[PDB]
UniProtKB/Swiss-Prot annotation:
PANTHER family named in the record: CELL DIVISION PROTEIN KINASE, CYCLIN-DEPENDENT KINASE 2
Positions carrying N6-acetyllysine: 6
Role according to the record: Serine/threonine-protein kinase involved in the control of the cell cycle; essential for meiosis, but dispensable for mitosis. Phosphorylates CABLES1, CTNNB1, CDK2AP2, ERCC6, NBN, USP37, p53/TP53, NPM1, CDK7, RB1, BRCA2, MYC, NPAT, EZH2. Triggers duplication of centrosomes and DNA.
Residues modified to Phosphotyrosine: 15, 19
UniProt-reported outcome of changing residue 15 to F: 2-fold increase in activity
Enzyme Commission (EC) number: 2.7.11.22
GO BP term, example: DNA-templated transcription
Residues that, per the record, bind Mg(2+): 126, 139
Gene transcribed to yield this protein: CDK2
Name this protein carries in UniProt: Cyclin-dependent kinase 2
Length: 290
């Protein structure tokens, strides 16, 4: 900590407070995360994350494990997608910039997924943007290293809006498909300027998904009915049209979105396949206003 002069609180992250800080010796401006907790397995896992380098992954600069405490030092980025969505809500983020952002995030996912590393907790607050038009994923890999709690150290409720249905149904093992689900949710929210599934409990989250995509059954999701938290008693809603769900989105975007939101994680499109989808045929990289 003392190697760093705290500039300001960015805010309270999943695992502890996050600060903009300056490296008092190198001049480097960084995001400093204190990890609220020791454990040798978290140490070796975090150490593996140091090598997982990609232009759309927030760079982990250093792990500081001193005085039985853990700090992570990241590349600093000045804005998150939530702030940027809020800032541009009168008109929406332009479609070419949505496409650029989705394309870059899928490249980041594809890279981490090829190394068997998952995010598990994608959300506008951990998608970070710069002035060169780049978008980057923050906190990749941390969930496996430390977990995902219900509440933060500060009692802020962790959001369920981007949680994949297999998680809500009590899947014990997560696949890369959970990140594709979240990213699809974020894609829809960029387009409509409304969260897709703003649940405020697990059942509310599940039943919001169900009311939009239809209650899943054995037809669309082989094995759904034997999942831990599946209840035969769930109401059986019918699916709605994507035309009604994400209106302005064109037929390519709707078609991609549909594949990122398949119930069965095995049927859900991979980041690699999604990058080849016709939706990206005219992708470009605009500069955002910021
Ligand atoms: N002003 S802002 O748009 O809210 C914003 C958002 C994000 C940052 N930077 C940030 C934030 C961050 O974690 C966030 C997660 C959500 C709670 C606040 C900390 N991790 C990071 N790694 C590199 N930059 N960085 C700075 C400002």
């Amino acid at each position: 900590m003392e190697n760093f002069q705290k500039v300001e609180k960015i805010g309270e992250g999943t695992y502890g407070v996050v600060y903009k800080a300056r490296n008092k010796l190198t001049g480097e401006v960084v995001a400093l995360k204190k990890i609220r907790l020791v454990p040798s397995t978290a140490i070796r896992e975090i150490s593996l994350l140091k090598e997982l380098n990609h232009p759309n992954i927030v760079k982990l600069l250093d792990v500081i494990h001193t005085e039985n405490k853990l700090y992570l030092v990241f590349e600093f980025l000045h804005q998150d997608l939530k702030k940027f969505m809020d800032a541009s809500a009168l008109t929406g983020i332009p479609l070419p910039l949505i496409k650029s952002y989705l394309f870059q995030l899928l490249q980041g996912l594809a890279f981490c997924h090829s190394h068997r590393v998952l995010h598990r907790d994608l959300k506008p607050q951990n998608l970070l943007i710069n002035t060169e038009g780049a978008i980057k994923l923050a906190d990749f890999g941390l969930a496996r290293a430390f977990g995902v709690p219900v509440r933060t150290y500060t009692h802020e409720v962790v959001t369920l809006w981007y949680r994949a249905p297999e998680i809500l149904l009590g899947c014990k093992y997560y696949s890369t498909a959970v990140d594709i689900w979240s990213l699809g949710c974020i894609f829809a929210e960029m387009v409509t300027r409304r969260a897709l599934f703003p649940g405020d409990s697990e059942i509310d989250q599940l039943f919001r998904i169900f009311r939009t995509l239809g209650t899943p059954d054995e037809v669309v999701w082989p094995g759904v009915t034997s999942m831990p938290d599946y209840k035969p008693s769930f109401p059986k809603w019918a699916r709605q049209d994507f035309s009604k769900v994400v209106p302005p989105l064109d037929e390519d975007g709707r078609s991609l979105l549909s594949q990122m939101l398949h119930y069965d994680p095995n049927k859900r499109i991979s980041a690699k396949a999604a990058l080849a989808h016709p939706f990206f045929q005219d992708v470009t990289k605009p500069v955002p206003h910021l």
